[PDB]
Amino acid sequence: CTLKSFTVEKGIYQTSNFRVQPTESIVRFPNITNLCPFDEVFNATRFASVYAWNRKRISNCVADYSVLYNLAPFFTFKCYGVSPTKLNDLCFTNVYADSFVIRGDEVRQIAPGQTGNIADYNYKLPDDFTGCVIAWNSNKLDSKVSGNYNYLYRLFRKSNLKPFERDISTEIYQAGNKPCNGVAGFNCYFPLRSYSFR
């Protein structure tokens, strides 16, 4: 079959390569069984705002990504750099969970390269962002019919926020050339305004 003929002449002919097949599937992962509280940032009480996003360093963990799907419908599970699945076979050194609450139409801006209002003044992701963004609607846990104004966000800032930077300052903005020197009035708009969730 390697010569494509039903009759072979006299001589030596190379046909294939004797490659020994594997036997076992040794893993040899580190010695870690402490299932750290990965549910403390997913199923907890009220969530952080965008200008004060909570950044929890998670190390010495057993990252079981098969526990965030049996919960409420998690949408837009977009991993940049890795696949959504096949995350249960990789050993990371230390991960960071940045938790906050945004609007429905503002979920697109949480992505490398995308710009807007939340991705430029509240939380910016770098172009080499090797992580996963996970969003889910909370209209039953973060909304009530009374007028919901317990979530703040920044609208005005001098320059664009650099990737992985938390801006919790309260310096007044100046939309014009008038030296407001801290009065919060005409052309001195407050930099942090509240949301409206009905």
Partner: nanobody
Framework: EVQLVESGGGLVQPGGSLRLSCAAS????????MSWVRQVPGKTPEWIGS???????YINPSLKSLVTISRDNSENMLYLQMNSLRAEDTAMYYC????????????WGQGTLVTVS
């Protein structure tokens, strides 16, 4: 070692002015945020006002021109002077320190019960 003690709890009638404040422990609680919140039974809390370290005070857009919180004592305490009482002001008022990032690093102090007849 945080044992915030509130005051102002009692029984009032519509038309007065509530001057409630929670005392902060002797420490450098500043350089971090500080706010107030109520715990009306039935659903999640409702944030009323903040006391940002810069001095700029932001108030809930719903409760505008009715509640005022200042810092002109600067010793160990805040102030909560709110007027125009109604029947729905009977809630459990708390003073949260690390708000807007809570549930992981916030310290809910004591709790007082107010009621407006």
């Amino acid at each position: 070692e945080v044992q915030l003690v509130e005051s102002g709890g009692g029984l009032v009638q519509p038309g007065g002015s509530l001057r409630l404040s929670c005392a902060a422990s002797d420490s450098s609680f500043y350089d971090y945020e500080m706010s107030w919140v109520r715990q009306v039974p039935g659903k999640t809390p409702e944030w009323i006002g903040s006391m940002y370290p810069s001095g700029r005070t932001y108030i809930n857009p719903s409760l505008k021109s009715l509640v005022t919180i200042s810092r002109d004592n600067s010793e160990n305490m805040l102030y909560l002077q709110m007027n125009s009482l109604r029947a729905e002001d009977t809630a459990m008022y708390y003073c949260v320190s690390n708000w807007a990032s809570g549930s992981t690093g916030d310290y809910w102090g004591q709790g007082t019960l107010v009621t407006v007849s």
